[PDB]
Design a protein around this ligand. Structure first.
Ligand SMILES: [Mg+2]
Ligand SMILES: [Mg+2]
Lengths: 84, 84
């Protein structure tokens, strides 16, 4: 009687860290609700339940990709890493 | 009638940073007094007046060399810098 995939816990700033971009406040919750997920917010952790048409959303990295592609890859800066 | 060089202002933890070593508290003040300097404390800043037989002591780096050599170079660790 409920077709939603399991909930996913993710830090609120995790998309920001993976992108290397400080997104405006509330971007991650806004974007993940736009794609149809239920987002509850406790502390610095989001609990994110994907909608039934998104069985591909299973871990934080899946959620990160949603935020980043909607914000657009162009906002991600180009920074060479420090190789040892 | 006073042959001392001019005073030198140096932050108390400057030798530590140049060495890459956290020396026990008071090491710089103790070493600089051993070599004959007059040392006074003002916050994190030392005022160091070299003795008259040390005209080579003119800038903070000269004071750093005094601390590092008496503590011994063996304590300085070996850390490759991240090069860009
Ligand atoms: Mg994906
Ligand atoms: Mg010297």
């Amino acid at each position: 009687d409920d077709w939603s995939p399991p909930p996913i816990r993710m830090g609120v700033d995790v998309p920001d860290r993976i992108a290397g971009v400080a997104y405006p406040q509330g971007t991650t919750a806004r974007r993940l609700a736009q794609i149809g997920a239920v987002v509850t917010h406790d502390g610095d952790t989001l609990t994110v339940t994907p909608p039934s048409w998104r069985p591909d959303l299973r871990q934080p990295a899946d959620l990160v990709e949603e935020v980043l592609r909607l914000e657009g890859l162009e906002v991600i800066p180009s920074v060479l890493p420090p190789a040892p």
